[PDB]
Design a protein around this ligand. Structure first.
Ligand code: GEH
Ligand code: GEH
Ligand code: SDM
Ligand code: SDM
Ligand code: MG
Ligand code: MG
Ligand code: MG
Ligand code: MG
Ligand code: MG
Ligand code: MG
Lengths: 5, 236, 236, 5
């Protein structure tokens, strides 16, 4: 999964 | 609300203790109670709210993906009928996730966003609104799926418009918003080219602004820039 | 009970799914419902029950230790008064932990132990009874603390007496019981010499029995033997 | 903390 903040 | 009798400051103090104890469901309930006191939140308090619910819903999302994977395998050719249980339990986790998303969206609508006038607060809350509609979109399959997706897009877009006018390109909230809207494009909107263009333009414009920053601000901004480049590496 | 309308087999199936999804609170609720169907549990089902509640209470114990540490620091000399919040929140976590322990002890008493006639089931349940009284003892400070400790000791002792008569020295349940009773001695009963003697004698008697085992049984027994030697290394 | 199972 891609990075999110 | 069960936290109605507790002092605002005590709720904030216990949210911080819950974070130290990795009790994120508690941390979220404490922050929900703090929001419901009706006063605006400080920068630190906005972080406590977002950390709490990000961890709760993150766990639910991970669980939902495990169960959805099992459910998909069960529906392939040659698989032995196992009954309704996998679907039921995926639906149970999904309903709990939707409930958390509705709760957060409820706090934003009643009444955090309408009182948020500074870019640092308003962009942060609108980004959160985009995030929790995005989580709803990840599990949506019904008549309202496109409207859920467009709700996420609309919130992210309003946040972007403000962030571009009112924040420097290295502002960590601007960067994090762009990171997440880029992931929305890639994973939800089936727009990988827009995801890549946004991540790249955001990265490059931040790079050009780093020279204005102190050492500590530099550290904050480059941290989020590295997440943009990590995603770009995944996608190209 | 909220699980009263669900089939026993569906509860077991969903407990296994919850474990895959690391949803241990769900897994425990499903196993509680399965126990409350009133039928005896199989070996695998006993493992599902113990894994679920071990993970739930393990998380609560970790949280309680974090908070107790903060509380102790707050009560040292020179520390600034912070109000009742740390104590309140430690008490909240502590009450929830005690509730989980009471629930498990309730299942064992009503009516798992009284129907468990084979050593493999009876020793397993009595070990669990010792474990959950031990967790209660870890947080106990009142008039009944010594009685809680003695309840743990009594359950562990009955389990030991049966295990020595009815199980080989390499049986993993016998080994795990001895591991945990040894920790009870060290950490709860202030009897480090008894803890060390039990771990060492258990290890040595298992060693001498390994030659009777298949490769797979050998792997199971040596795994628990290594935990005995790890504790011995910590303690000597 | 010591090991238990
Ligand atoms: S607000 C939580 C504290 N911040 C963080 O954990 C990191 C990820 C380092 O920074 C950001 C979080 C959220 C945003 Cl919108 C931007 C930076
Ligand atoms: S019953 C859960 C499955 N078993 C285990 O996880 C390990 C730790 C490998 O074995 C034992 C667990 C519990 C006992 Cl009493 C003995 C072995
Ligand atoms: C924004 C105001 O204070 C922060 C700045 C930067 C990182 C963090 S982490 C955090 C927390 N309790 N997780 C708060 C903050
Ligand atoms: C005892 C019957 O079956 C097991 C033997 C050995 C290890 C495990 S682990 C496990 C579980 N769901 N965690 C079940 C078992
Ligand atoms: Mg007040
Ligand atoms: Mg649904
Ligand atoms: Mg553009
Ligand atoms: Mg039935
Ligand atoms: Mg108490
Ligand atoms: Mg002896």
């Amino acid at each position: 999964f891609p990075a999110t903040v | 609300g069960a936290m109605g009798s507790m002092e605002r400051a005590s709720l904030i103090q216990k949210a911080k203790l819950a974070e130290q104890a990795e009790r994120y469901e508690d941390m979220a309930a404490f922050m929900k109670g703090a929001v419901e006191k009706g006063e605006e939140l400080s920068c630190e308090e906005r972080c406590l709210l977002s950390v709490a619910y990000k961890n709760v819903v993150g766990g639910q999302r991970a669980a939902w993906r495990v169960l959805s994977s099992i459910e998909q395998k069960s529906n392939e050719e040659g698989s032995e009928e196992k009954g309704p249980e996998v679907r039921e339990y995926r639906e149970k986790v999904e309903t709990e996730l939707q409930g958390v998303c509705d709760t957060v969206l409820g706090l934003l609508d009643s009444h955090l966003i309408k009182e948020a006038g500074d870019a640092e607060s308003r962009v942060f809350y609108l980004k959160m609104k985009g995030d929790y509609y995005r989580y709803l979109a990840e599990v949506a399959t019904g008549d309202d799926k496109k409207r859920i997706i467009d709700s996420a897009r609309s919130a992210y877009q309003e946040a972007m418009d403000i962030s571009k006018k009112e924040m420097p390109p290295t502002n960590p909230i601007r960067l994090g918003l762009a990171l997440n809207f880029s992931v929305f494009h890639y994973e939800i909107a089936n727009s990988p080219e827009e995801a890549i263009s946004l991540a790249k333009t955001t990265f490059d414009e931040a790079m050009a602004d780093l020279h204005t920053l102190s050492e500590d601000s530099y550290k904050d901004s480059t941290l989020i820039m590295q997440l943009l480049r990590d995603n770009l590496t995944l996608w190209t």
